[PDB]
Design a protein around this ligand. Structure first.
Ligand SMILES: NC(=O)c1ccc[n+]([C@@H]2O[C@H](COP(=O)([O-])OP(=O)(O)OC[C@H]3O[C@@H](n4cnc5c(N)ncnc54)[C@H](O)[C@@H]3O)[C@@H](O)[C@H]2O)c1
Ligand SMILES: NC(=O)c1ccc[n+]([C@@H]2O[C@H](COP(=O)([O-])OP(=O)(O)OC[C@H]3O[C@@H](n4cnc5c(N)ncnc54)[C@H](O)[C@@H]3O)[C@@H](O)[C@H]2O)c1
Lengths: 405, 405
């Protein structure tokens, strides 16, 4: 009998990655797995516009109920796409909304390692991206000349109820952006614990990455991480052989960290950073390693009731350059491994949390990984790995299908 | 006779780069050059503290008068360094202050190429970093729970004098950063002209880099760039064979652009970006190429009277990690070429704008460049280029000194 898929949220996107995942669902999953328990949502920018984002609100609700989500890449539409797609409005990112809506703590993005496949980093690299805050949460306007005033009224402490000026400035340009955001730092305690725990288990040296010299408001990110490190982890790292006695936790400036990602080809390190810095640095990490096909991503959030909410995704976008080529009848070669690891993670988590066909799901998802890893080993991967002699998107999908059984 | 140095502003920093420039001034410059016309300023974090940043205000004024500045790297002190260095407060960056104070348009950061020396990028890469805006001039506070409100009152147009809410949010964290900034976009018209003109002359394909999908306030950066391109440059790029007919200006997402910097090892491209994106991406550019010793940096600003204000600098910081090694008595190997190119640029510009010993200054600055390039060609460069067999900082400085005359 087909495997019974456990309840799981499936978020569909568009462009090349939706095309790829339709093939994978059709040729790898459905002949072996009954997916009736999946809740599938259409997060095409068009459908979001048609539903006034009710579909996004529904994904967020379902994630709370089900706790295991696979998220395909989605489009955050440009002004030019607003016209081409016939959207009544620009729409923001559905990723920020989900990350916020699930009380996101960390987006973990780690390098993939396959026995016998030489990649950019020799040993595992771990990345913890702060899942919320920063410019992803910003209010803004595009304006001309005028007065911009920011105030804060605390609700606790000796100055409760009194308003202070955070900033006031005259805009003297006919064209300017004015932007306000916050960084919520309470859950950076949780992030630090999670990050240092994983680094300890993988035996990699941790680094904290910020621009706190100039972006001085970021100081608590560093201070919280250092305090958690010193009080809960420093001794464990020394005892495990990962760091030496008297070796302090190291801070890197975000610009310098881009240099460390190129330089540190041995791997064997971890970085934690704010939301946007993590976005930039994890794409860089992907390309140094090989491509975004060789990175895993997952979000850890928390339900109001305290149970974890786990979303799994590729690190990358919808691969619009290959989509253009696809629609013109030209060859493409999208590496599905990143996305597939996400779907594996989500399916395994779903089966464990909801106690449905656990053994068989784990064996099947392990099999998908194995087959993919073996094709890569045999030089029958996609072109990101193998160069021009690699297989096309469709060739690779079929090669996996033949070996699954 | 020693060469007469033209009036020029010289900004000294601290740590390793100040140590190196002290040696270079002593051993390369002063034996051949009378530096009496230089106006030198001490921007040690301690001296900024001792003078309440009067020294920084003096630099900015002198820059306006003299229009040719060499800026060594400086320390923007951390909270931790405030204590160690005995500072009354955590001073901001001198760089942001100078960039604003000189009506900064562009920070041009370009790859260095030396005949016969294999580096990361085969052909020239050009970067235009918007010199002002963004989080570099943010107002901010670190706060607890309360109400954050941002308002804007336009001074022109039909709603002049009426106040609108830009943003309002409740902070629910005990520890949060609240931040307001602006991006001034009027001078992006000038940046676009300077960028496309430079790319046209170098015959490189230009790209614009932003996060305008999610950071939607950035749209005008792209639109301004694209309009200037379409109206003033596209036809010229086609005519010069740099782009084909019907080929549009390409936009890249900032996170994706980090991948393009690793992948595009052929070089022969240009990127333009906002202030912070430029900071991050130009450090990455440096490391992919070889190190920060193989990048040039200069700031183009504009005096109230319309005259160019040109500041020259290395792309990098004070190289604190080598300074710590130096002070423990360990070997170092700082590549001075980045900084030296800045000093060259500033000396030449000074001689030209103030009409003092031009031929001889140009010959001597060319000689410094030639001697450095030749040592690199001979495998007698610093360890960033040559590996462990390369010269120490001091060996390299002495090697150049011996060949100067
Ligand atoms: N998490 C997300 O949902 C997410 C992330 C990034 C971008 N996007 C969206 O995706 C679209 C495209 O953005 P983009 O072009 O900047 O980013 P992208 O990650 O789709 O592509 C960037 C580059 O990497 C390559 N690439 C990415 N994944 C690959 C894979 N698995 N195999 C081989 N090559 C791969 C692409 O061909 C392209 O050259 C946009 O609409 C953007 O809003 C979404
Ligand atoms: N323009 C500036 O004034 C500027 C820029 C960046 C950092 N800083 C300041 O510099 C200090 C150090 O910051 P950082 O360590 O993040 O940056 P950094 O640029 O000093 O060093 C970053 C890394 O690059 C290496 N490196 C840099 N320049 C080099 C060269 N010429 N040759 C060989 N290796 C080189 C360093 O050894 C280090 O590993 C901080 O106090 C910071 O505020 C100043």
């Amino acid at each position: 009998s087909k495997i019974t898929a456990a309840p799981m949220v499936y978020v569909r996107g568009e462009e090349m990655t939706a095309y790829v995942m339709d093939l994978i669902r059709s040729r790898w999953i459905e002949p072996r797995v009954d997916v009736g328990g999946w809740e599938t949502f259409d997060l095409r920018a068009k459908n979001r516009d048609d539903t006034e984002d009710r579909v996004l609100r529904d994904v967020i609700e379902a994630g709370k109920r089900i706790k295991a989500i696979f998220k395909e890449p989605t489009v955050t539409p440009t002004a030019d796409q607003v016209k081409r797609l016939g959207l009544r409005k620009s729409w923001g990112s559905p990723n920020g909304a989900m990350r916020r809506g699930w009380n996101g703590i960390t987006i973990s993005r780690d390098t993939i390692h396959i026995d016998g496949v030489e990649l950019g980093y020799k040993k595992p690299v771990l990345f913890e991206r702060h899942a919320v805050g920063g410019e992803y949460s910003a209010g803004y306007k595009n304006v001309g000349k005028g007065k911009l005033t920011t105030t804060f009224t605390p609700s606790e402490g000796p100055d409760a109820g009194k308003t202070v000026v955070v900033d006031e400035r005259e805009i003297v340009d006919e064209e300017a952006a004015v932007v306000t955001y916050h960084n919520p730092y309470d859950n950076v305690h949780d992030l630090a614990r999670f990050f240092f725990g994983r680094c300890l288990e993988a035996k990699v040296t941790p680094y904290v990455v910020t621009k706190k010299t100039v972006f001085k408001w970021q100081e608590p990110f560093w201070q919280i991480m250092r305090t958690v490190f010193d009080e809960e982890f420093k001794a464990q790292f020394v005892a495990a052989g990962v760091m030496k006695e008297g070796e302090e936790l190291v801070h890197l400036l975000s610009d310098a960290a881009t240099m460390k990602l190129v330089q540190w080809r041995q791997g064997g390190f971890g970085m934690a950073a704010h939301n946007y810095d993590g976005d930039v640095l994890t794409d860089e990490l992907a390309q140094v390693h090989k491509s975004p096909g060789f990175i895993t991503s997952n979000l850890v959030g928390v339900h109001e009731d305290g149970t974890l909410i786990k979303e799994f995704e590729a690190s990358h976008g919808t691969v619009a350059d290959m989509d253009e080529a696809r629609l013109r009848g030209e060859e493409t070669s999208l590496n599905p491994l990143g996305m597939v690891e996400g779907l594996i993670g989500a399916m395994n988590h779903a089966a464990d949390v909801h106690n449905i066909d656990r053994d068989r799901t784990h064996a099947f998802t392990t099999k998908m990984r194995t087959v993919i890893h073996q094709l890569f080993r045999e030089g029958k991967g996609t072109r990101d790995l193998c160069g021009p002699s690699g297989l096309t998107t469709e060739q690779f999908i079929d090669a996996v299908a033949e070996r699954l059984d």
